[PDB]
């Protein structure tokens, strides 16, 4: 019911790893399940911060996490490295950033600015 007819969120229930789907297989006096799961493969260390300061306001990722290569900062997915520019769409604001611990100063790009110029 939970592995074949749907995608189970339970851990290690429909196989080890992030469950994708399962395929039943008939067996004599039994059943065999072929659990297809998603497994992260190749890692990379990145510097991360809980939030970012732009104009005295704390910025947090709407979905994802802040990461930093040697020089720059990007917001990426939680399960796959797809860095993107920190923009107002990617992050949401909350109060001022003298309260968060470990916040890092950086610019938050505004998608409206380039189009407002034209």
């Amino acid at each position: 019911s939970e592995c074949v007819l749907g995608q189970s969120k339970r851990v290690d229930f429909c196989g080890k790893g992030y469950h994708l789907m399962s395929f039943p297989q008939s067996a004599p006096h039994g059943v065999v399940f072929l659990h297809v799961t998603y497994v992260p493969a190749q890692e990379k260390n990145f510097t991360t911060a809980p939030a970012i300061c732009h104009d005295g306001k704390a910025h947090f990722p709407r979905e994802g996490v802040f990461v930093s290569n040697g020089t720059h900062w990007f917001v990426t997915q939680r399960n796959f490295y797809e860095p993107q520019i920190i923009t107002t769409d990617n992050t949401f604001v909350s109060g001022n950033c003298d309260v968060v611990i470990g916040i890092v100063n950086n610019t938050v790009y505004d998608p409206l600015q380039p189009e407002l110029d034209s």
């Binding site: 851990v11 799961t37 992260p40 890692e43 260390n45 809980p50 470990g102």
Partner: protein, 49 residues
């Protein structure tokens, strides 16, 4: 040290504060509250233990 990552594959390091933020997002609470009240939350956790 690795949240739930080590249970689904290779263990991936992550700061414990950010892991708790992940939990807070999971339970439907915005992560920012965790960073805003981290000291209090850690105190409550230690007291509960």
């Amino acid at each position: 040290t690795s949240g739930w990552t080590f249970g689904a594959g290779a263990a991936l390091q992550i700061p414990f504060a950010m892991q708790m933020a992940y939990r807070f997002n999971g339970i439907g609470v915005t992560q920012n509250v965790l960073y805003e009240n981290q000291k209090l939350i850690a105190n409550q956790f230690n007291s509960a233990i």
